[PDB]
Amino acid sequence: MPSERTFIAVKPDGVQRNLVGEIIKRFENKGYKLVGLKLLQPTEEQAKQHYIDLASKPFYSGLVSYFSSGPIVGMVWEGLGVVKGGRVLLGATNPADSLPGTIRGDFAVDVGRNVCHGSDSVESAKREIAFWFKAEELVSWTSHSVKQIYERA
Template identity: 65%
Template sequence: MAEQRERTFIMKHYSDLSSRPFFPGLVKYMSSGPVVPMVWEGLNVVKTGRQMLGATNPADSQPGTIRGDLCIQVGRNIIHGSDSVESAKKEIDLWFTEKEVVGWTPANENWVYE
């Protein structure tokens, strides 16, 4: 479900970037409209997910990636993805309550995983 977050929430999410010169613009952009937070899971999900997203700089992203197809400028790269399992856990805890993260088994799991 799309939701809009306050600047203070976005500042907390990106606190590791707070000393970077682009931080104020990032916070302004990410709090300017609704976002769709989600949790992905699966084998090597961080690595696979980041490959699907494309490079942080859209100009360096391959066609067929989200950023490669839908982005033009690095400051408007349309999607965020955790850079590690540890970051993902921190971000999931920030964005979701325990009840909002529902575990489930996909129907095709036996066909996808060994």
């Protein structure tokens, strides 16, 4: 259904390198609907929990330190297939494997400085959204372009 949601974050390198607007533009251009947006400074414990599935991996310590080293921009986007589609926009995890046209393909080199995050499944997206956003920070609204973007609307 077009009401699917995903969590996207500009990581601290993406904020530092002035990629916030560019990343948001790509999601707006695609037809996805912005329903949550904030600038925040993750704590180490927040980073640990966000990446909890990766706790045994050797990059985890550095990942958690880096993710909490400076501000991120957290977002919630709504749209048909937006979890998968958000990942398509981001490009492959390792920028070396990402193609031009994607965020990581255009703007990143190193897997540890890969500028952005996106939820990897509908289930993890729900968890991430719930973790980073309060219900008061999510806005219910209708895009005036909804019938131009979706057939069934």
